[PDB]
Design a protein around this ligand. Structure first.
Ligand code: URS
Ligand code: URS
Ligand code: URS
Ligand code: OGA
Ligand code: NI
Ligand code: ZN
Length: 331
């Protein structure tokens, strides 16, 4: 078995290897990359996402989210308070202000220490889930707006034609902005490109050990657990690497820098934070190996978790028994 310790693997494809997206994902998995839950892909030196980022300041963040924490430094939840709209130029200025800017630090490890010590005492503002893309239409390789769709994958594998679309989302971050412990909708893959700015640090639990994280989460957030059998779908819970180690949860960590791709694999729980002002683009995708994970994916039916239009068909076809109750998530 490849990669039995479930290490995060880093790949350096050649420009020739960067042509066929599906083929390279399959290659990564042949080397055991999926066992970690997360992989890094460094693009060929000849590749670029677009020419420059000089003209992005007029993009609108219609609903910036202030991430307010509750709990203790290593075990907390966050809720998202809606703020007034602002442009990316305005957001960048805010990120760089004295109130919100990255503190002086020695290295990534020093900044990580500062994050877990002090995160809960601040409320950074995030521009998340903004439909759009910053890939040039002429970028032919690993263009996240030009991937094969999940709906076409399901049709190719299972022969059923379904409604729905999937398109990329942009994320504008600042120091301490946080993504909570989660797997993707329907335990899909995700791919994330860091277009510009400061790094993003990731934590990940191997898919074969996901239930260990779930059990700890139930212990650490007992009221939330009683409210919903899949409350990590709410994407609001944080657990520090120190607390994971104290409880024997297997995990790994890695820092993503501008110009690098990360791929998360089916049922790979992940969480993380941004180092400073940055912009990332991400989208979900599927492969034939995903189908069995989609069939088994937990669902939130308490009504808290966000439901995309396109997830309906996934639940309807892959989980027909759960569909009525999940669809009771409704409204
Ligand atoms: N072990 C790492 S980090 N990467 C890698 C990628 C391809 C082939 C062999 C090794
Ligand atoms: N062709 C589609 S829809 N997706 C996909 C992605 C990676 C590998 C194989 C297939
Ligand atoms: N290196 C880190 S992240 N250490 C740490 C220890 C205790 C509390 C918070 C962080
Ligand atoms: O970048 C973020 O804030 C969160 N991204 C992801 O969870 C992802 O790409 O799967
Ligand atoms: Ni994710
Ligand atoms: Zn729920």
């Amino acid at each position: 078995a490849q990669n039995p310790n479930c290490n995060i693997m880093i790949f350096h494809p050649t420009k020739e290897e960067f042509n066929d997206f599906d083929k390279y994902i399959a290659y990564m998995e042949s080397q055991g990359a999926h066992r970690a839950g997360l992989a890094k892909i460094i693009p060929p030196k000849e590749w670029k996402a677009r020419e420059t980022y000089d003209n992005i300041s007029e993009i609108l963040i219609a609903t910036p989210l202030q991430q307010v924490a509750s709990g203790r430094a290593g075990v907390f939840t966050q809720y998202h308070k809606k703020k007034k709209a602002m442009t990316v130029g305005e957001y960048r200025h805010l990120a760089n202000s004295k109130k919100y800017q990255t503190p002086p630090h020695q290295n990534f490890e020093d900044l990580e220490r500062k994050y877990w010590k002090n995160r809960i005492y601040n409320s950074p503002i995030y521009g998340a889930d903004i439909s759009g893309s910053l890939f040039d239409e002429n970028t032919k390789q690993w263009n996240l707006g030009h991937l094969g769709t999940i709906q076409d994958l399901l049709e190719k594998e299972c022969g059923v034609v379904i409604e729905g679309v999937n398109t990329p989302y942009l994320y504008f971050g600042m120091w301490k902005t946080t993504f909570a412990w989660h797997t993707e909708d329907m335990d899909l893959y995700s791919i994330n490109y860091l277009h510009l700015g400061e790094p993003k640090t990731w934590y990940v639990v191997p898919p074969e050990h996901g239930q260990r994280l779930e059990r700890l989460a139930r212990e650490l957030f007992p009221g939330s657990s009683r409210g919903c059998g899949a409350f990590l779908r709410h994407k609001v819970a944080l657990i520090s690497p120190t607390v994971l180690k104290e409880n024997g949860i297997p995990f790994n960590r890695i820092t993503q820098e501008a110009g690098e791709f990360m791929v998360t694999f089916p049922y790979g729980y992940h969480a993380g934070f941004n180092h400073g002002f940055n912009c990332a683009e991400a989208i979900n995708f599927a492969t034939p190996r995903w189908i069995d994970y989609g069939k088994m994916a937990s669902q939130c039916s308490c009504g808290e978790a966000r439901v995309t239009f396109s997830m309906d068909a996934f639940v309807r076809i892959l989980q027909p028994e759960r569909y009525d109750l999940w669809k009771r998530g409704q409204d």
